[PDB]
Design a protein around this ligand. Sequence first.
Ligand SMILES: Cc1cc2nc3c(=O)[nH]c(=O)nc-3n(C[C@H](O)[C@H](O)[C@H](O)COP(=O)(O)O)c2cc1C
Lengths: 190, 191
Amino acid sequence: LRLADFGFTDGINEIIAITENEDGSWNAAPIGIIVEDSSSDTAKAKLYRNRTRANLERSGVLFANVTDDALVFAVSSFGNLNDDWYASPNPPIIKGAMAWCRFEAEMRSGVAHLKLTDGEIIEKRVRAINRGLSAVIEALVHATRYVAIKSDERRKELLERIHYYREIVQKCGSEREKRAFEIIMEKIGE
Amino acid sequence: LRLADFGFTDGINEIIAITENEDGSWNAAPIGIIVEDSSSDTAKAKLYRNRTRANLERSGVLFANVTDDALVFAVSSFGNLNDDWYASPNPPIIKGAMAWCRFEAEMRSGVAHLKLTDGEIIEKRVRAINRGLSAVIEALVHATRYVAIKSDERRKELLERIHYYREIVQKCGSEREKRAFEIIMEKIGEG
Ligand SMILES: Cc1cc2nc3c(=O)[nH]c(=O)nc-3n(C[C@H](O)[C@H](O)[C@H](O)COP(=O)(O)O)c2cc1C
């Protein structure tokens, strides 16, 4: 199998990582899958102390959903998705996803070493470049840092970045990106 | 026709605007097409005094190519594509474009009032979100401004943003985004 056949390129691919909880329910969270060669079946992801890492340590199985849905990224950055977000429970396939794939994973020093074993394209799409989508994704990077730090000066700097990206989403984004951004603002206490 | 059927959403859609020069050749430049209702056939673009605007004043015809190709954006940001970038000379499709559209355009003091009249979906695709692609697009916004202005304080601000986005492209982008960023650095005098 080739990573490129499921929407991955070399570089870092921001996807929704779906992993099985101990009770059999799914956990969904954004992660960046790092790819050196998209013609290959190997990749990796460096994971923080979160449910994704805890599940992969136990199960060694990671599903990925390839999606450009700002809302799914915003919600899953701050909490789990509910069953209502899924079009399919097995394999797990969030509504609106363009593709899914399955990786076997081996954790070493906080890095999930991945081997692609299955997947399918669900829906190819066309969308013009949208800076509002870019802005939601960047804001998520800063907001997730913002909530993890106590420094008032560092937080001030991050909030300025978040406001900068908010102006872009308000000007450029579709209603879906604007909705996603309001989730970010709510979650961080703004 | 409906804008949504050719890849446009409400908001601003960054596309490649292709317009006819005085000599019949094509001019290509990134432009944002502003959409209030993607179910409709109407849109707008706000244009500075550039070749796209001058060409629309003469012809009232705007072709749009919907593409996610970082290299097409970077090259067209700083000049014309010429003739090797096109899969079709008429209607102008750029190689790799996902869709093309044709708009009638009425210029009203820098605002192009657009009506969608023709178009085709060429190729639907799938690509995971990539922050390197985001960063190329942001850097192009700042770099096209940088090269057009003389303010020292403003150029200083813009160069800082460009350097910030460069780091994101190096970390996250594919080789295609990296190649696109190399064009930016060359064009701003940091090659
Ligand atoms: C993503 C992006 C969007 C842009 N949108 C616009 C726009 O909507 N209106 C405008 O006047 N310039 C816009 N620009 C700047 C022009 O593309 C740039 O100045 C170019 O040199 C104009 O070329 P032309 O003289 O061939 O029209 C945009 C640039 C980027 C990279």
